[PDB]
Design an enzyme around this catalytic site. Structure first.
Site, PDB file in Angstrom:
ATOM      1  N   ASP A 129     -60.999  21.401 -55.508  1.00  0.00           N
ATOM      2  CA  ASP A 129     -61.583  20.508 -54.268  1.00  0.00           C
ATOM      3  C   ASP A 129     -62.251  19.168 -55.190  1.00  0.00           C
ATOM      4  O   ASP A 129     -62.068  18.133 -54.621  1.00  0.00           O
ATOM      5  CB  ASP A 129     -62.314  21.214 -53.253  1.00  0.00           C
ATOM      6  N   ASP A 130     -63.245  19.689 -56.046  1.00  0.00           N
ATOM      7  CA  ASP A 130     -64.020  18.634 -56.423  1.00  0.00           C
ATOM      8  C   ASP A 130     -63.151  17.632 -57.404  1.00  0.00           C
ATOM      9  O   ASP A 130     -63.809  16.340 -57.344  1.00  0.00           O
ATOM     10  CB  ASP A 130     -65.265  19.433 -57.185  1.00  0.00           C
ATOM     11  N   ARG A 148     -72.669  25.905 -60.122  1.00  0.00           N
ATOM     12  CA  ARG A 148     -72.722  24.477 -59.500  1.00  0.00           C
ATOM     13  C   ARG A 148     -72.654  24.671 -58.019  1.00  0.00           C
ATOM     14  O   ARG A 148     -71.617  23.911 -57.687  1.00  0.00           O
ATOM     15  CB  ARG A 148     -72.061  23.665 -60.446  1.00  0.00           C
ATOM     16  N   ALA A 206     -67.156   8.280 -65.952  1.00  0.00           N
ATOM     17  CA  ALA A 206     -65.927   8.715 -66.490  1.00  0.00           C
ATOM     18  C   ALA A 206     -65.496  10.276 -66.713  1.00  0.00           C
ATOM     19  O   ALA A 206     -64.727  10.550 -67.618  1.00  0.00           O
ATOM     20  CB  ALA A 206     -65.760   7.988 -67.900  1.00  0.00           C
ATOM     21  N   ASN A 262     -72.677  12.874 -54.269  1.00  0.00           N
ATOM     22  CA  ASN A 262     -72.698  13.657 -52.741  1.00  0.00           C
ATOM     23  C   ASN A 262     -74.043  13.610 -52.010  1.00  0.00           C
ATOM     24  O   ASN A 262     -74.123  13.487 -51.064  1.00  0.00           O
ATOM     25  CB  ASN A 262     -71.957  14.891 -52.638  1.00  0.00           C
ATOM     26  N   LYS A 276     -65.938  28.277 -46.994  1.00  0.00           N
ATOM     27  CA  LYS A 276     -64.693  27.344 -46.994  1.00  0.00           C
ATOM     28  C   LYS A 276     -63.471  28.106 -46.104  1.00  0.00           C
ATOM     29  O   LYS A 276     -62.800  27.334 -45.572  1.00  0.00           O
ATOM     30  CB  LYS A 276     -64.395  27.103 -48.573  1.00  0.00           C
ATOM     31  N   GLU A 296     -64.019  26.836 -56.603  1.00  0.00           N
ATOM     32  CA  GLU A 296     -65.307  26.235 -55.833  1.00  0.00           C
ATOM     33  C   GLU A 296     -66.617  26.221 -56.533  1.00  0.00           C
ATOM     34  O   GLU A 296     -67.089  27.479 -56.538  1.00  0.00           O
ATOM     35  CB  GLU A 296     -65.078  26.742 -54.589  1.00  0.00           C
ATOM     36  N   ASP A 297     -67.407  25.228 -56.543  1.00  0.00           N
ATOM     37  CA  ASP A 297     -68.756  25.104 -57.105  1.00  0.00           C
ATOM     38  C   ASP A 297     -68.644  25.857 -58.457  1.00  0.00           C
ATOM     39  O   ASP A 297     -69.908  26.613 -58.729  1.00  0.00           O
ATOM     40  CB  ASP A 297     -69.505  25.614 -55.999  1.00  0.00           C
ATOM     41  N   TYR A 321     -70.330  25.540 -43.217  1.00  0.00           N
ATOM     42  CA  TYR A 321     -70.111  24.849 -44.832  1.00  0.00           C
ATOM     43  C   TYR A 321     -71.205  23.793 -45.075  1.00  0.00           C
ATOM     44  O   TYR A 321     -72.394  24.252 -44.617  1.00  0.00           O
ATOM     45  CB  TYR A 321     -68.760  24.434 -44.787  1.00  0.00           C
ATOM     46  N   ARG A 350     -68.778  40.323 -35.766  1.00  0.00           N
ATOM     47  CA  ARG A 350     -68.687  41.209 -34.549  1.00  0.00           C
ATOM     48  C   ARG A 350     -67.248  40.824 -33.616  1.00  0.00           C
ATOM     49  O   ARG A 350     -66.699  41.770 -33.113  1.00  0.00           O
ATOM     50  CB  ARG A 350     -69.796  41.026 -33.553  1.00  0.00           C
ATOM     51  N   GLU A 370     -64.488  14.019 -64.652  1.00  0.00           N
ATOM     52  CA  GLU A 370     -63.110  14.525 -64.349  1.00  0.00           C
ATOM     53  C   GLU A 370     -62.802  14.054 -62.678  1.00  0.00           C
ATOM     54  O   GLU A 370     -61.759  13.914 -62.439  1.00  0.00           O
ATOM     55  CB  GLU A 370     -63.010  16.087 -64.876  1.00  0.00           C
ATOM     56  N   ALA A 371     -63.872  13.847 -61.969  1.00  0.00           N
ATOM     57  CA  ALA A 371     -63.995  13.440 -60.953  1.00  0.00           C
ATOM     58  C   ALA A 371     -63.505  11.947 -60.861  1.00  0.00           C
ATOM     59  O   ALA A 371     -62.359  11.730 -60.218  1.00  0.00           O
ATOM     60  CB  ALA A 371     -65.451  13.178 -60.374  1.00  0.00           C
ATOM     61  N   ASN A 378     -64.926  13.276 -46.868  1.00  0.00           N
ATOM     62  CA  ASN A 378     -65.215  14.565 -46.732  1.00  0.00           C
ATOM     63  C   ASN A 378     -64.050  15.411 -47.087  1.00  0.00           C
ATOM     64  O   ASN A 378     -63.073  15.282 -46.487  1.00  0.00           O
ATOM     65  CB  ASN A 378     -65.802  15.058 -45.313  1.00  0.00           C
TER      66      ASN A 378
HETATM   67  N1  LIG Z   1     -66.383  12.278 -52.939  1.00  0.00           N
HETATM   68  C1  LIG Z   1     -66.574  13.400 -52.679  1.00  0.00           C
HETATM   69  O1  LIG Z   1     -66.830  13.689 -51.440  1.00  0.00           O
HETATM   70  C2  LIG Z   1     -67.445  14.459 -53.782  1.00  0.00           C
HETATM   71  C3  LIG Z   1     -67.112  15.677 -53.616  1.00  0.00           C
HETATM   72  C4  LIG Z   1     -67.611  16.467 -54.583  1.00  0.00           C
HETATM   73  C5  LIG Z   1     -68.498  16.061 -55.509  1.00  0.00           C
HETATM   74  N2  LIG Z   1     -68.720  14.699 -55.648  1.00  0.00           N
HETATM   75  C6  LIG Z   1     -69.337  13.959 -56.803  1.00  0.00           C
HETATM   76  O2  LIG Z   1     -68.954  13.908 -58.140  1.00  0.00           O
HETATM   77  C7  LIG Z   1     -69.874  13.553 -58.945  1.00  0.00           C
HETATM   78  C8  LIG Z   1     -69.635  14.150 -60.468  1.00  0.00           C
HETATM   79  O3  LIG Z   1     -70.583  13.914 -61.177  1.00  0.00           O
HETATM   80  P1  LIG Z   1     -71.367  14.766 -62.325  1.00  0.00           P
HETATM   81  O4  LIG Z   1     -72.992  14.523 -61.922  1.00  0.00           O
HETATM   82  O5  LIG Z   1     -71.016  16.251 -62.047  1.00  0.00           O
HETATM   83  O6  LIG Z   1     -71.381  14.438 -63.792  1.00  0.00           O
HETATM   84  P2  LIG Z   1     -69.889  14.334 -64.512  1.00  0.00           P
HETATM   85  O7  LIG Z   1     -69.904  14.814 -65.907  1.00  0.00           O
HETATM   86  O8  LIG Z   1     -68.821  14.896 -63.854  1.00  0.00           O
HETATM   87  O9  LIG Z   1     -69.530  12.776 -64.794  1.00  0.00           O
HETATM   88  C9  LIG Z   1     -70.849  11.899 -64.463  1.00  0.00           C
HETATM   89  C10 LIG Z   1     -70.175  10.693 -65.239  1.00  0.00           C
HETATM   90  O10 LIG Z   1     -71.287   9.808 -65.025  1.00  0.00           O
HETATM   91  C11 LIG Z   1     -71.744   9.407 -66.206  1.00  0.00           C
HETATM   92  N3  LIG Z   1     -73.293   9.109 -66.207  1.00  0.00           N
HETATM   93  C12 LIG Z   1     -74.414   9.748 -66.055  1.00  0.00           C
HETATM   94  N4  LIG Z   1     -75.532   8.978 -65.970  1.00  0.00           N
HETATM   95  C13 LIG Z   1     -75.087   7.531 -65.971  1.00  0.00           C
HETATM   96  C14 LIG Z   1     -75.792   6.395 -65.955  1.00  0.00           C
HETATM   97  N5  LIG Z   1     -77.002   6.437 -65.834  1.00  0.00           N
HETATM   98  N6  LIG Z   1     -75.062   5.432 -65.817  1.00  0.00           N
HETATM   99  C15 LIG Z   1     -73.605   5.387 -65.892  1.00  0.00           C
HETATM  100  N7  LIG Z   1     -72.968   6.343 -65.968  1.00  0.00           N
HETATM  101  C16 LIG Z   1     -73.657   7.643 -65.960  1.00  0.00           C
HETATM  102  C17 LIG Z   1     -71.555  10.512 -67.142  1.00  0.00           C
HETATM  103  O11 LIG Z   1     -71.532  10.215 -68.357  1.00  0.00           O
HETATM  104  C18 LIG Z   1     -70.206  10.921 -66.643  1.00  0.00           C
HETATM  105  O12 LIG Z   1     -69.419  10.136 -67.271  1.00  0.00           O
HETATM  106  C19 LIG Z   1     -71.084  14.412 -58.505  1.00  0.00           C
HETATM  107  O13 LIG Z   1     -72.395  13.420 -58.385  1.00  0.00           O
HETATM  108  C20 LIG Z   1     -70.965  14.814 -57.034  1.00  0.00           C
HETATM  109  O14 LIG Z   1     -71.972  14.644 -56.031  1.00  0.00           O
HETATM  110  C21 LIG Z   1     -68.095  13.684 -54.743  1.00  0.00           C
END
Ligand SMILES: NC(=O)c1ccc[n+]([C@@H]2O[C@H](COP(=O)([O-])OP(=O)(O)OC[C@H]3O[C@@H](n4cnc5c(N)ncnc54)[C@H](O)[C@@H]3O)[C@@H](O)[C@H]2O)c1
Ligand SMILES: NC(=O)c1ccc[n+]([C@@H]2O[C@H](COP(=O)([O-])OP(=O)(O)OC[C@H]3O[C@@H](n4cnc5c(N)ncnc54)[C@H](O)[C@@H]3O)[C@@H](O)[C@H]2O)c1
Ligand SMILES: NC(=O)c1ccc[n+]([C@@H]2O[C@H](COP(=O)([O-])OP(=O)(O)OC[C@H]3O[C@@H](n4cnc5c(N)ncnc54)[C@H](O)[C@@H]3O)[C@@H](O)[C@H]2O)c1
Ligand SMILES: NC(=O)c1ccc[n+]([C@@H]2O[C@H](COP(=O)([O-])OP(=O)(O)OC[C@H]3O[C@@H](n4cnc5c(N)ncnc54)[C@H](O)[C@@H]3O)[C@@H](O)[C@H]2O)c1
Ligand SMILES: NC(=O)c1ccc[n+]([C@@H]2O[C@H](COP(=O)([O-])OP(=O)(O)OC[C@H]3O[C@@H](n4cnc5c(N)ncnc54)[C@H](O)[C@@H]3O)[C@@H](O)[C@H]2O)c1
Ligand SMILES: NC(=O)c1ccc[n+]([C@@H]2O[C@H](COP(=O)([O-])OP(=O)(O)OC[C@H]3O[C@@H](n4cnc5c(N)ncnc54)[C@H](O)[C@@H]3O)[C@@H](O)[C@H]2O)c1
EC number: 1.1.1.38
Lengths: 551, 551, 543
Positions: free
Chosen positions: C256-257, C143, C290, C399, C161, C233-234, C90, C69, C292-293, C444
């Protein structure tokens, strides 16, 4: 946006070329007669109708009628038959049209800025509805070539020239803004006409004149940008020339009478230099005239020689000038401006009173006429060149035809067909008494302004260097085929002005980037593909909404 | 007109009910989620969501949210569940909504005319964008029923009532104009609120008040026509009543508190008269109250008797009034206005001090309460009627519930279920000690204003006669089925308010033409088909352009 | 332009704050109540109304009501109370709001591109009314962090966002395009729903899906230019990470992630370094995860180390990763990506079976948890770090609070207040028995995406390098004042997100010009003035 407005907007109107589905989906069904045609048959109908009419003025009204009705059809037919119609849309007909048919059709086009609006010019500029104007062409209507002071009826010239920006270089019509500055008129034919569309006063020649052009320049620039291309057209020479000097560095501006003439002039000399292969130090140029035109052409000859191995001071010494007061030599009764210095030399022991004398003593390979005095290339002068040179170069560049230094007829007969002649004037072929026929060189500013304008806009260039016109000159002449150079052509055929204007634009684009005068980044790898891809085209777009089934 | 605007205009927005082809052809594709639904499933989703919420105020916000988003969906769901939602959209909830949620959502609807705009009211009226306004409903927000002076937050009442014009009689929304006149407010809750949307002054009660309502009446009339229907809503009774008298003949206006009450009142008496078949001269009416309400209902009883074979002077003698000062009789201490004369009679030899006394001596078949004093139908009064009559008619018409003359509970128990009772107040069923259950008569102005408004507009009628409300009364009661009259219904079920409102409109249409008060000619042969065909409907129109092949 | 449309257009509507002059001039006299207000009175009015709203979800509906509005007023009130309203508009309540949005209210906004619109994506892009879009945020909504697969109802998150792009960094709203791609959903509760707004089909995971994304990218770029910032995003962790790799060289894109998370994580680590000054030689980083985060955080850490005088592979030697199959080690039984290889090292004499055992053998200075598996930073793991390190760095970044590797409580208590702790979760202050009070760092993504976005748009940047995020991380930590570092803060206060966001935009702008990644010429001489005077504002314009 749909319905009637689509038809009343010439930028979207397709007329009878509106598809059945387009007519049905966009709410045109019943507003057009029940027949679909194409741009092809639309264009064919027009060409056929134009062939029934014979008056250039009548051809102007008919074709300018379409420009107001159907933009893309107007530029199709214009480009279909460009050699024939460039003289109708623009010079020489546009000047003749303005004068006669200003008072009858009275159809406003472009922006009118009067001296009545001193201080508020920005607010008049703000009324123009297009937001991304890239090219401004402005007149005060003081010197329409071969008519004179036409006041606000001058508006026709900027309009006509902008038509050629689009036709020749594919510059976007929506990005073009014709302007007419009204400071009055000195023409009592207009001041006494109760139906005159302009201000009823003598031309304002006070400081208020200089301040308004200043305010206009600032205003256009403050809305559209610093890089906005600006040309002055059919201003008084004194105004046009002093304004080029005042604004050339602060603004993105160029002048056809000085810089287009220099490019066209040099292009012709360079063409002459391909058939006559006469060496650089076998060259000596003599100008009739020592004004801004002579200086501009001379500057560009100097710069061409310097790129070919000579020195600025060596090149200068090959160029002589002869004005009203005679030959320009160190220490003489008459004035010598500081721009004329470089081509003012130590006197030879004989000093001439007439130009004829000056030719005989200096023995130049080339005479260039830019005096605007009349037939100063007299038979004795033309005869003297034929004597001194195997193939004399004779350029009679002064316009119009009345002011030209010699005819093609008298240039070719009195040198028995051995001269390489060019003019701004339209001389027909000339037949000698041995049978053979010569078509003279016609220098035309349309060779230069389209290509230059397109490059400067496409590059977001803010300053137009002398080297642009140098590069323009080379680009023009480099397009003459070996077959064409053997037939004695000094200038490409006007029928190919599109291909010509685009190749010049590609070559100036190359120059502006290579010399850090472009602001459009990232710089393209291929400058040819960069331009060939940003040209506006006359093909109709689909306005049909995308209807499709969902799987 | 196509693209986003179609979606932001609630008059054309279909939301998810936009067809795939409509979305593709009109340029909506991608502006909606990728799913087509119908009005049916849109409506179904809303009903389902409303069933999860329980607060009337919450139901108001949800449903008034749709009216701003999707006009036709709003009137579908409103008409789908009309008995439940008429009390949400309008009284009693709208009054409760205005007060609480005026300051929070602050969404302007309808036209605001303040006393600040004295002299320029025409120019404020000119700002309303709809050109063919047929129905105006105006408030000054002084007396919202059961809350009081809400100032400009009063705007909600005209809006709500206009919703029922459309829902009940299918009057066009675009042809309706809610108005709020701001002369100040006497409510310091608003005058001390920094977030109050109205003028910060006490209500202007000077000549400037009377002149502004005059200027408004002229203004609406000068733009929209002389036949433009005008109702005053929740004005102070003194203002509402004196304004009915000032404008009733000059303008096309009617008042629900006087004329709707008279129609609803008479409709109920006529219903009572179908089960009790008690003869005309066995009838004697006693009013508690002798104001404009009593006069209006009384006038319509007189006119009904005169159509059934009695004389104006005979009918009058069957009607008695008892105001603050007691019974209205020729020669008494207290004033008798010239409108009260016709029902002021020669005293009976006993003269009563209390209404109870007046019942016992006069022995009326019907008591009608319109005093707004409170429980003046005391058990002794109710008991006395049960004594004097087999089936006493007891109408406690004073609103709201606090001001009502007696409850349904105390009316039915103290007459042991033998009274024919009606009220304006919403009393639930009442259970006697012998087991059997009575559902009381609820008089509701919504029975009358929709049908009357539709007839007057459809006929281009310029004056609303007493006989309109007479004809309205007969039309209402003539719709009670013989089965329904046996169960003791005095008023049709509200669930059928549409069919009811349209049949009333057909019957007033018949009356207005038969008596040369219609200006819409040619006069229709069949008045039923004339109205059933001009009702606005909530079904979505196709906005799809007509695409078809050419043979 | 005139009268009712002027009020029905949220871009132009000033509501009650339309001046008498404007009302007289624009045909509004009568269409508005008598009362004339200032933005200050509207905002104040509104802040009061919002405080008696009880639910964060009821708040969302009210404030997003104003967004539909009065756009100026919406951004005023959002900026006024930015810390409290950021999590309303958000993450997290946008996700919960999405869950039960499109049922009761179901107003439409943004651009919806269906898998059904295959080969016709350009039509749809051409239907968006705005001609100068500079910032696109896109989701397929597979996601949504916390809720998971919310299908077409995931639109609310791009919208959420873009609101922060504008509130935080003053990016023009009319130059923002939220996009939801509908490819089906795997959410069964949502496929069975008759009033669901998306395609009733399972997520198309075929080549058609990859082709749609290619068509979107090309469509957005053809209309609005190759400059156009496109943010994913997501998206599914599978797709988001591979689409980043695919497009980030070809278009102007970031995730972003991965890159935002990486930048905020590093900024924290960098803040931790100013406090403890650990000799860079001694630094040993151990990731739980391990993914991509982890790879994004790791890449930025080595880039930090290289910039401070370590060689590339000498920096990689200092970073160890542990996933579901234990430590990432050369010739290990389980599988290792080519992006995991540089952080895969020769086996130490004893091979850790457990994360606790990984801590004790490797004895790292920093542990970073990005595994989303819950409380794997166990009391024994936290005690181990406390014993090995004077000031151990514990970042629990998974998170949603329930699957954070540990709590602030656990971290500060079992470490005797010696640990430098950050999470992505909203943990409260921790008070130890010794009376000292610790405020944990809340990483954040909003610290990064606004300022980075503004800088890329303003510089007409076409490719966003890893160094942009390294420079953004450094820009963030430099915002930290000596007092704030002394008090043991790892991030600047969120109350100052605007100042923080605009300073970051200025540092990134300087970097982009310095490294010939800016194509906006002429080059500004005062970068701070160039950025500051180009930010859109909530101040009402004159009409
Ligand atoms: N820092 C931030 O502000 C921020 C922002 C966005 C997302 N995130 C977080 O990033 C994370 C990415 O992880 P994902 O859940 O998408 O999976 P993913 O596949 O991206 O990575 C998870 C990793 O953890 C491993 N893993 C799973 N279970 C396990 C255990 N019991 N012991 C040891 N390692 C294990 C997996 O094999 C993999 O290598 C999310 O949990 C999300 O909450 C953080
Ligand atoms: N066509 C439209 O209606 C329209 C209007 C505004 C903006 N845009 C979009 O904005 C984007 C930004 O433009 P850009 O900087 O990439 O342009 P560009 O880099 O392709 O062109 C460089 C400069 O030349 C101009 N130009 C290009 N073609 C021209 C022609 N035929 N005649 C005259 N001038 C011409 C441009 O305005 C610009 O100043 C474009 O991708 C375009 O799609 C389109
Ligand atoms: N008809 C028109 O609209 C029109 C008007 C003016 C100029 N022009 C053209 O534009 C050009 C600009 O001219 P300008 O402004 O430099 O004029 P100018 O008078 O400033 O300079 C012209 C040069 O010619 C010389 N000249 C004049 N009469 C001469 C004579 N009898 N013999 C030898 N030299 C002589 C002058 O001394 C001067 O050096 C001219 O070449 C002309 O062709 C056209
Ligand atoms: N629908 C439109 O957009 C529109 C607008 C203007 C005029 N018109 C055309 O002008 C013609 C002239 O009208 P007419 O005199 O025959 O009307 P009419 O004789 O059918 O109706 C008589 C009067 O009642 C009004 N009316 C009719 N249906 C109504 C409804 N549902 N709610 C409220 N008012 C209603 C009319 O405005 C008129 O004053 C019509 O045939 C109509 O098609 C149509
Ligand atoms: N709450 C409200 O918003 C509100 C306010 C006023 C009226 N109303 C309704 O509208 C109607 C209009 O009333 P009005 O303007 O004619 O009021 P009024 O005072 O002008 O007349 C009402 C009549 O009731 C009589 N009356 C008052 N007190 C009495 C008593 N104790 N015993 C017997 N008679 C008594 C008066 O003398 C008068 O004849 C009322 O019937 C009332 O139900 C509602
Ligand atoms: N210098 C100033 O005081 C100032 C202030 C505001 C606007 N401007 C305008 O900048 C113009 C220069 O042209 P330009 O627009 O190509 O250069 P610019 O510097 O304004 O453009 C920078 C780039 O970022 C975009 N942009 C700028 N501000 C933005 C914002 N707040 N949100 C999202 N995107 C944004 C632009 O479209 C462009 O792509 C001037 O004509 C002037 O009107 C100047």
């Amino acid at each position: 946006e749909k319905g009637k407005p689509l038809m009343l907007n010439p930028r979207t109107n397709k007329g009878m070329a509106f598809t059945l589905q387009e007519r049905q989906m966009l709410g045109l069904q019943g507003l057009l007669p029940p027949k679909i045609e194409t741009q092809d048959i639309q264009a064919l109908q027009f060409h056929r109708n134009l062939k029934k009419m014979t008056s250039p003025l009548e051809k102007y009204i008919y074709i300018m009628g379409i420009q107001e009705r159907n933009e893309k059809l107007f530029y199709r037919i214009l480009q279909d038959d460009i050699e024939s119609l460039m003289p109708i849309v623009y010079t020489p007909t546009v000047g003749l049209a303005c004068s006669q048919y200003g008072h009858i059709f009275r159809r406003p086009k472009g922006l009118f800025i009067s001296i009545s609006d001193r201080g508020h010019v920005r607010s008049i500029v703000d009324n123009w509805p297009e937001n991304h104007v890239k090219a401004v062409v402005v007149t005060d209507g003081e010197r329409i070539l071969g008519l004179g002071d036409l006041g606000v009826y001058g508006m026709g010239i900027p309009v006509g020239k902008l038509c050629l920006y689009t036709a020749c270089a594919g510059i976007r019509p929506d990005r073009c803004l014709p302007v007419c500055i009204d400071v009055g008129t000195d023409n009592i034919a207009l001041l006494k006409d109760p139906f005159y569309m302009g201000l009823y006063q003598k031309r304002d020649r006070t400081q208020q004149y200089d301040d308004l052009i200043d305010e206009f320049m600032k205003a256009i620039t403050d809305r559209y940008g610093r890089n906005t291309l600006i040309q002055f057209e059919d201003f008084g020479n004194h105004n046009a020339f002093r304004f080029l000097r005042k604004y050339r560095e602060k603004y993105c501006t160029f002048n056809d009478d000085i810089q287009g003439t220099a490019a066209v002039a040099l292009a012709g000399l360079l063409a002459a230099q391909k058939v006559i292969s006469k060496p650089i130090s076998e060259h000596k140029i003599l100008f009739l005239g020592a004004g801004e035109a002579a200086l501009g052409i001379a500057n560009l000859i100097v710069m061409s020689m310097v790129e070919n191995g000579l020195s600025e001071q060596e090149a200068q010494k090959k160029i002589w000038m002869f004005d009203k007061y005679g030959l320009l030599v160190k220490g003489r009764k008459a004035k010598i401006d500081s721009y004329q210095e470089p081509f003012t030399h130590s006197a030879p022991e004989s000093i001439p009173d007439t130009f004829e004398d000056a030719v005989n003593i200096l023995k130049p390979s080339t005479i260039i006429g830019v005096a605007g005095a009349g037939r100063l290339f007299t038979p004795d002068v033309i005869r003297a060149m034929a004597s001194i040179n195997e193939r004399p170069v004779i350029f009679a560049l002064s316009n119009p035809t009345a002011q030209a230094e010699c005819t093609a007829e008298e240039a070719y007969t009195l040198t028995e067909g051995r001269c390489l002649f060019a003019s701004g004037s339209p001389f027909g072929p000339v037949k000698l008494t041995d049978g053979r026929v010569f078509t003279p060189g016609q220098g035309n500013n349309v060779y230069i302004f389209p290509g230059v304008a397109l490059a400067v806009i496409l590059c977001n260039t803010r300053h137009i260097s002398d080297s642009v016109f140098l590069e323009a000159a080379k680009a023009l002449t480099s397009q003459l085929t070996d077959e064409e150079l053997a037939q004695g052509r000094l200038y490409p055929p006007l029928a190919n002005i599109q291909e010509v204007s685009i190749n010049i634009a590609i070559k100036v684009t190359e120059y502006l980037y290579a010399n850090k005068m472009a602001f459009r980044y990232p710089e393209p790898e291929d400058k040819a593909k960069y331009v060939k891809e940003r040209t506006w085209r006359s093909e109709y777009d689909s306005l049909l909404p995308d209807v499709y089934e969902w799987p």
